[PDB]
Write a protein that holds these residues in place. Structure first.
Motif, short mmCIF file in Angstrom:
data_model
loop_
_atom_site.label_atom_id
_atom_site.label_comp_id
_atom_site.label_asym_id
_atom_site.label_seq_id
_atom_site.Cartn_x
_atom_site.Cartn_y
_atom_site.Cartn_z
N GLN A 11 0.81 -1.30 -0.02
CA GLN A 11 0.11 -0.10 -0.18
C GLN A 11 0.82 1.27 0.17
O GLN A 11 0.43 2.41 -0.32
N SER B 188 1.33 4.28 -3.44
CA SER B 188 0.01 4.90 -3.58
C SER B 188 0.05 6.49 -3.46
O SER B 188 1.10 6.79 -2.76
N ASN B 189 -1.02 7.31 -3.91
CA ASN B 189 -1.02 8.74 -3.81
C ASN B 189 0.41 9.33 -4.36
O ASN B 189 0.75 9.83 -3.47
N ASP C 120 2.96 10.92 -7.68
CA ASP C 120 3.22 11.55 -8.61
C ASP C 120 4.37 10.91 -9.59
O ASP C 120 5.37 10.46 -9.15
N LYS D 86 2.18 12.58 -14.34
CA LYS D 86 0.77 12.03 -13.83
C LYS D 86 0.58 11.65 -12.57
O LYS D 86 1.61 11.55 -11.74
N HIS D 87 -0.45 11.61 -11.98
CA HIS D 87 -0.78 11.24 -10.61
C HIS D 87 -1.52 9.74 -10.46
O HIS D 87 -2.33 9.42 -11.41
N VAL D 88 -0.86 8.90 -9.67
CA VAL D 88 -1.56 7.59 -9.42
C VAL D 88 -2.00 7.28 -8.02
O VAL D 88 -1.34 7.61 -7.08
N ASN D 89 -3.32 6.91 -7.88
CA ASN D 89 -3.97 7.07 -6.53
C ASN D 89 -3.33 5.92 -5.97
O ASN D 89 -3.05 5.57 -4.72
N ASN D 90 -3.66 4.44 -6.61
CA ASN D 90 -3.04 3.22 -6.18
C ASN D 90 -2.98 2.31 -7.24
O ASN D 90 -3.36 2.67 -8.52
N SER E 86 -3.94 -1.55 -8.94
CA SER E 86 -5.07 -2.67 -8.46
C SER E 86 -3.96 -4.00 -8.52
O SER E 86 -4.73 -5.02 -7.85
N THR F 217 2.50 11.43 0.17
CA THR F 217 2.24 11.34 1.56
C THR F 217 3.70 11.22 2.13
O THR F 217 4.36 10.12 2.11
#
Ligand SMILES: CC(=O)N[C@@H]1[C@@H](O[C@@H]2O[C@@H](C)[C@@H](O)[C@@H](O)[C@@H]2O)[C@H](O[C@@H]2O[C@H](CO)[C@H](O)[C@H](O)[C@H]2O[C@@H]2O[C@@H](C)[C@@H](O)[C@@H](O)[C@@H]2O)[C@@H](CO)O[C@H]1O
Ligand SMILES: [Ca+2]
Length: 136
Positions: free
Chosen positions: A74, A77-78, A80, A94-98, A100, A122
């Motif tokens: 995890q 996550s969050n 760039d 680009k931003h990547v949140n998480n 899959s 973070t």
């Protein structure tokens, strides 16, 4: 079966912990088990980041980022993924949140860049990457 222009290029990162030096993300090895020696690791920085220097400008298409897989998945996550030119001007982000799955693929559509940086947004989270592959 395409030329990965990041392989064996100079790398840096925000700090090193657990001997997770930044060159492990360009060592040709996608293995995400941290104990394999294939995976980077920074300290818990403000924020943690990793970068590859292509040495010259090139036209970047696909960037494929492979996560740690044995634990703490995890943490990636969050974040760039940022392209910089020869003078470190930001040319695309680009931003990547998480994730899959075990990797994420981003297409920068031919953007000219020298540096590709992966930056957690973070703070206080170590950044660990199994491999970052970059294609023309
Ligand atoms: C040389 C040595 O003993 N290494 C330890 C780390 O332990 C090894 O690596 C782990 C990933 C596991 O595979 C473990 O079985 C193996 O010995 C140790 O990692 C922690 O190990 C404990 C079990 O003792 C937990 O699995 C914990 O989740 C592990 O920590 C994660 O992995 C680390 C590499 C860091 O990313 C941590 O922030 C994670 O939480 C570490 C930390 O105690 O110490 C080394 O010296
Ligand atoms: Ca690797």
């Amino acid at each position: 079966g395409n030329l990965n222009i990041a392989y064996a290029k100079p790398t840096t990162q925000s700090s090193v912990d657990y001997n997770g030096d930044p060159n492990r993300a360009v060592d040709g090895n996608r293995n995400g088990n941290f104990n394999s020696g294939s995976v980077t690791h920074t300290r818990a920085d403000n924020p943690s980041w990793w970068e590859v220097d292509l040495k010259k400008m090139d036209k970047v298409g696909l960037v494929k980022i492979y996560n740690r897989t044995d634990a703490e998945t995890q943490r990636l996550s969050n974040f760039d993924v940022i392209l910089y030119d020869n003078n470190r001007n930001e040319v695309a982000k680009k931003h990547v949140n998480n994730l899959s799955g075990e990797s994420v693929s981003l297409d920068f559509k031919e953007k000219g860049a020298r540096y590709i940086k992966v930056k957690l947004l973070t703070s206080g989270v170590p950044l660990s990457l199994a491999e970052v592959e970059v294609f023309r």
